[PDB]
């Protein structure tokens, strides 16, 4: 007379995975990774992110809350907090201590900026907190936010030591199974032989040439080309280097396997929840771009690691006893230099300094703009009051100046989003992404293909356009029929779907709805 439930559900989010990575490299994947999810599970091929900006902290938050920044409070990886008078990192919390490391900047993090509950929170509430909930990622934000407010543990990678650590928000000390894993020095083992392509490099016909102008550098090498023979020496000097290799994903999945065993995840009938973010596809993509040989090799190597991961699930939990959903927190644009080489619309988006000089000339006061980030601009309320300036005047001028920019498609006040002459889906995505306390006073929408000038190599992601917002969404295992769909869905539909499969209450700020055709 019990509610039918899987023994374990695994939430995998491949960082920066554009949907078309599934098919650009389709002919090179094996049978047990992405193709196992496609061939035995359900693929939603028309899922878009229903907010902006399409960055990491929000993506992981919205996947697991079914909510939007306007409600759940995570308005980006960073945001300007006008009451604190400074920019704020999404997970930074100076009321906790590092656990397993002495670095405060690496370990002082918590989910305290998250206002809405997660599906992992709701599982704990539905099982009287007998459920094992563990988050794993190289990035603090991508481990903490999916895990929720009261998980068994949330672990992330310490660049200063090469170990997985946590904070006193979770436990006073690292569990034995984490110390055991760290002491193996898996990172050293992985980078020992450098980085060569898994296949013969001549076969990477889905990619550009190896040496192109728009690709960044890795480690000590001064050309963006294989082979990366000095990886082991470079990793030793900077252990954060492993983030920008396929071995960062391999490390993460071995850590996730250690979490399954260290917490007995999936052995009894009480549903456990493992969340793991694969961050290296984002680091590699940021440095080399979606058309690089580097990125293609990262996905061929991730594909094999996922096959090993699913095979370990079959032995430790049992096929049919676990539920997997795979998605991404966002896509990515093509590199500006790549698009220019092929005549596609593209370009680059120092606004705070430049506009403040103009605002200075126009109104006579300096530092009128407090911050410019996430395609928004914040005005310094302290400067406006002391200078006797109106927010609307100062805002109207900046918007008029921004309309002149060749990269600007729309500019609008965040007080007047609904009435603006902007089509859907852009208008509602701007609404969903606008958090009253933590978002700026002006919203900017860039033309297609334009990227930030923060780095003129590699690529980035933040915009509404389909290349950033079109994410894969694959379900596999317990309670999932095989199939695929081109019906439109939202990222905020993921958590409601898992909630319905588990017969648990939806998260507290959820705005999405279950994907009914998946539940079979
Ligand atoms: Zn990301
Ligand atoms: Zn290259
Ligand atoms: Zn259990
Ligand atoms: Zn990124």
What DSSP character marks residue 377? E
Q: Are 177 and 316 members of one domain?
A: yes
Query: Within this chain, do residues 60 and 146 fall inside the same structural domain, yes or no?
Result: yes
Place of tokens 């009261």: 150
Tokens linked to 415: 């007080």
User: Do residues 68 and 432 touch, judged by C-beta distance below 8 A?
Assistant: yes
SS3 (DSSP) at 61:
helix
Q: What is the domain range of residue 401? A: 342-456
Q: Which of 402, 424, 456 is the last residue of a domain?
A: 456
| Residue 99 burial (CB count, 10 A) | 19
Across the strands, what pairs with 42?
A: 475, 483
Annotated ligand binding at 140? The verdict is: yes
> Residue 288 — φ and ψ, nearest 5°?
-115, -25
Residues facing 473 on adjacent strands: 327
451 close to 461: Cβ distance less than 8 angstroms: no
Catalytic positions are 56
User: Residue 382 Cα, ligand 3 centroid: separation in angstroms?
Assistant: 52
Angle at alpha carbon of residue 239, lines to 234 and 240, rounded to 5°: 105
Residues at Cβ < 5 Å from ligand 4 ion: 282
SS3 call for 248: helix
C-alpha span between 102 and 108 (Å, rounded) = 10
Distance separating alpha carbons of residues 457 and 289, to the nearest angstrom: 8
Strand segments, DSSP code E, in 335-375 are 347-348, 369-373
Compute the distance between CA of residue 341 and CA of residue 335 in angstroms, rounded to an integer: 10
Look-up of token digits 């904070």 = 167
Cα 415 from Cα 113, distance rounded (Å):
23
H or E element, residue 497: helix 494-502
Q: For residue 141, say whether it is annotated as part of any ligand binding site.
A: yes
| Cα-based torsion angle of the residue sequence 282, 307, 276, 265 in order, rounded to the nearest 10 degrees | -170
Q: Which ligand is nearest to the CA of 332?
A: 4
Is residue 15 annotated as involved in ligand binding?
Answer: yes
What is the separation of C-alpha 432 from the centre of its chain, rounded to a whole number of angstroms?
Answer: 18
Q: What are phi and psi of 291, to 5 degrees?
A: -100, 10
Q: How far apart are CA 506 and CA 126, in angstroms?
A: 11
Q: 274: CA distance to ligand 3 center in Å?
A: 11
Question: How was this one solved?
Answer: X-ray
Which ligand gives the minimal distance to the CA of 244?
4
Question: What distance in Å separates the CA atoms of residue 256 and residue 181, rounded to the nearest whole number?
Answer: 10
Tokens of 222: 């001064």
> Which residues, 6+ apart, have CB-to-CB distance to 424 below 8 Å?
none
Does 464 lie in the same domain as 427? no
Asked if 402 and 392 sit in the same domain, the reply is yes
Does residue 261 share a domain with residue 400? no
Nearest CA to 433 among 476, 491, 354? Answer: 491
Pair 318, 461 in one domain: yes
| E strand or H helix at 384 | helix 381-387
Question: 417 and 484 share a domain?
Answer: no
Question: Can you give the CATH number for the domain in which 387 is found?
Answer: 3.30.1360.150
Angle at 244 between CA 463 and CA 65, to 5 degrees: 45
Query: What single string gives the DSSP state of each residue in 480-496?
Result: B-SEEE-S-EEGGGHHH
Structure token digits, residue 181:
């894993």
SS3 (DSSP) at 133: strand
Cis omega (within 30 of 0) for bond into 384: no
Ramachandran bin of 388, using left for φ above 0, alpha for ψ from -120 to 50, beta for the remaining angles: left
Distance (Å, rounded) from C-alpha 68 to C-alpha 58? 8
My answer on whether 224 and 234 are in the same domain is yes
Taking phi first (over 0 means left), then psi (-120 to 50 degrees means alpha), and beta for anything else, what does residue 219 get?
A: left
C-alpha R_g of the chain: 23
Q: Is residue 410 within 8 Å of 446, Cβ to Cβ?
A: no
Do 333 and 356 lie in a common domain?
no
Return the closest-CA partner of residue 13 out of 362, 495, 513, 417.
495
Do 313 and 42 touch, CB atoms closer than 8 A? Answer: no
Rounded distance, CA 120 to CA 137, Å? 16
461 is in an annotated binding site: yes
Q: Which residues contact 314 (CB under 8 A, 6 or more apart)?
A: none
Annotate 184-231 with three-state secondary structure.
CCHHHHHCCCCECCCCCHHHCCCCCCCCCCCCCCCCCCCCCCCCECCH
Q: How many beta carbons lie within 10 A of that of residue 344, not counting itself?
A: 12
Look up residue 210 and give its two tokens: 């190896």
Both tokens of residue 378? 């914040």
Q: What are phi and psi of 64, to 5 degrees?
A: -100, -10
Compute the distance from residue 52 Cα to the ligand 1 centre, in Å: 13
Contacts of 354 (CB under 8 A, 6+ apart): none
- The tokens describing 301, both together, are 């190597």
Q: Which of 431, 429, 401 is nearest to 415 (CA)?
A: 431
Do 76 and 100 belong to one domain?
A: yes
Per the annotation, does 438 bind a ligand? no
DSSP string for 233-244: HHHHH-GGGGGG
Residue 468, judged by CB atoms within 10 A of its CB (0-12, 13-18, 19+), counts as buried
Q: How far is residue 456's CA from residue 63's CA, in Å, rounded to a whole number?
A: 30
Cβ neighbours, 10 Å, residue 209? 11
Closest CA to 421 of 445, 440, 392: 445
Residue 473 and residue 463: Cα distance in Å, rounded?
19
Contact 167, 247 (CB under 8 A): no
Q: Which residues place a Cβ less than 5 A from the ion ligand 2? A: 210, 224, 292-293
Q: Print burial letters for 299-335: b (CB count within 10 Å at least 16), e (below 16).
A: bbbbbbbbbebbebbeebbeeebbbbbbbbbbbbbbb
Check: CB of residue 305 under 8 Å from CB of residue 439: no
Residue 325 belongs to domain with CATH number = 3.40.720.10
Distance CA 137, CA 253 (A): 9
User: CB–CB of 379/413 below 8 Å?
Assistant: no
28 within 8 A of 300, measured Cβ to Cβ: yes
**Cα–Cα distance for residue pair 87/78, rounded to 1 Å:** 7
Q: What letter would DSSP give residue 519?
A: B
Is 329 assigned to a binding site?
yes
Helices (H) and strands (E) in the chain — how many of each? Answer: 20, 21
Task: List, in order, residues 6 or more apart from 368 with CB less than 8 Å away.
Answer: 356, 359, 360, 379, 380, 383, 384, 387, 389, 394
Ligand 3 centroid – CA 127 distance (Å)? 10
Statement to judge: residues 96 and 127 lie in one domain = yes
Spatial strand order in the sheet of 442-446: 369-373, 376-379, 442-446, 408-413
The alpha carbon of 16 and the centre of ligand 1 are apart by a number of angstroms equal to 5
Residue 342 known to bind ligand: no
Centroid of ligand 2 to alpha carbon of 206 (angstroms)? 13
Tell me the residue length of the chain: 520
Distance CA(138)–CA(280), nearest Å, equals 8
CA gap 376, 440 in Å, rounded: 5
The last residue of a domain, from among 426, 456, 486: 456
Per DSSP, the three-state class of 438 is coil
Q: Which of 433, 456, 479 is the last residue of a domain?
A: 456
92 with 236, same domain: the answer is: yes
Ligand index nearest the alpha carbon of residue 460: 4
**Resolution, angstroms, 1 dp:** 1.7
Beta bridge partners of 246: none
Ligand nearest, relative to CA of residue 329: 1
Angle between helices 247-262 and 280-288 (to 10 degrees): 170
Those residues whose C-beta lies under 8 Å from the C-beta of residue 423, and which sit 6 or more positions away, are none
List the end-to-end C-alpha distance of the chain, in Å, as a whole number. 20
Tokens of 75: 């308005």
Q: Helices 119-126 and 56-65 meet at what angle, rounded to 10? A: 30
Strand partners, 10: 274, 324
Distance CA(77)–CA(57), nearest Å, equals 5
Please give the distance, rounded to the nearest whole angstrom, from the Cα atom of residue 268 to the centre of ligand 4. Answer: 37
Structural domain total, the chain: 2
Discontinuities after residues in the chain (C–N over 2.5 A): 349
């Amino acid at each position: 007379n019990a509610v039918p439930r899987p023994k374990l559900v695994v939430g995998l989010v491949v960082d920066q995975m554009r949907w078309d990575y599934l098919y650009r490299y389709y002919s090179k994947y094996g049978e047990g990774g992405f193709k196992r999810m496609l061939n035995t599970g359900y693929s939603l091929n028309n899922v878009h992110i229903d907010y902006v900006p399409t960055v990491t902290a929000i993506g992981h938050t919205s996947i697991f809350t079914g909510s939007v920044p306007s409600i759940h409070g995570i308005a980006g990886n960073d945001w300007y907090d006008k009451e604190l008078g400074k920019s704020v990192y999404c997970t930074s919390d100076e009321t906790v201590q590092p656990v397993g490391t002495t670095s405060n900047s690496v370990g002082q993090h918590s989910p305290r900026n998250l206002w809405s509950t997660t599906v992992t929170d709701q599982l704990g509430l539905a099982t009287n907190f007998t459920s094992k909930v563990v988050g794993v990622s190289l990035k603090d934000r991508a481990s903490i936010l999916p895990a929720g407010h009261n998980p068994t543990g949330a672990f992330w990678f310490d660049d200063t030591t090469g170990k997985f650590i946590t904070s006193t928000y979770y436990t006073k000390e690292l569990p034995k199974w984490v110390n055991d894993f760290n002491n193996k020095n898996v990172p050293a083992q992985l980078v020992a032989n450098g980085w060569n392509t898994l296949l013969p490099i001549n076969q990477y016909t889905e990619s550009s040439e190896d040496n192109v102008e728009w690709e960044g550098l890795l480690g000590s090498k001064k050309t963006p080309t294989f082979p990366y023979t000095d990886l082991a020496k470079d990793y030793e000097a900077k252990k954060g280097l492993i983030r920008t290799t396929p071995f960062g994903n391999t490390l993460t999945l071995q850590m996730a396997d250690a979490a399954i065993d260290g917490n007995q995840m999936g052995v009894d009938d009480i549903t456990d929840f493992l969340t793991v973010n694969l961050a290296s596809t984002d680091y590699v993509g940021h440095n080399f771009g979606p058309n690089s040989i580097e990125v293609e090799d990262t996905y061929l190597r991730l594909d094999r690691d996922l096959a090993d991961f699913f095979n370990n699930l079959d032995k430790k939990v049992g096929k049919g006893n676990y539920l997997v959903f795979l998605s991404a927190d966002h896509g990515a644009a093509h590199s500006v230099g790549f698009m220019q080489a092929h005549k596609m619309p593209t370009g680059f988006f120092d606004m705070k300094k430049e506009m403040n000089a103009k605002l200075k000339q126009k109104f006579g006061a300096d530092n009128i703009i407090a911050a410019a980030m996430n395609y928004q601009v914040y005005f310094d309320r302290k400067v406006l009051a002391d200078s006797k300036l109106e927010l609307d005047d100062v805002r109207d001028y900046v918007m008029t100046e921004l309309k002149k920019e060749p990269s600007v498609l729309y500019v609008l006040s965040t007080d007047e989003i609904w009435e603006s002459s902007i089509p859907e889906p852009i208008k509602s995505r701007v609404i969903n992404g606008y958090n009253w306390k933590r978002s700026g006073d002006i919203q900017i929408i860039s033309k297609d293909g334009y990227l930030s000038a923060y780095s003129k190599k590699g690529t980035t992601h933040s915009v509404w356009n389909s290349y950033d917002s079109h994410i894969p969404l694959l379900f596999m295992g317990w309670g999932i029929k095989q199939g695929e769909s081109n019906q439109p869905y939202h990222m905020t539909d993921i958590a409601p779907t898992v909630s319905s499969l588990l017969k648990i209450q939806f998260p507290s700020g959820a705005v999405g709805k279950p994907i009914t055709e998946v539940i079979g």
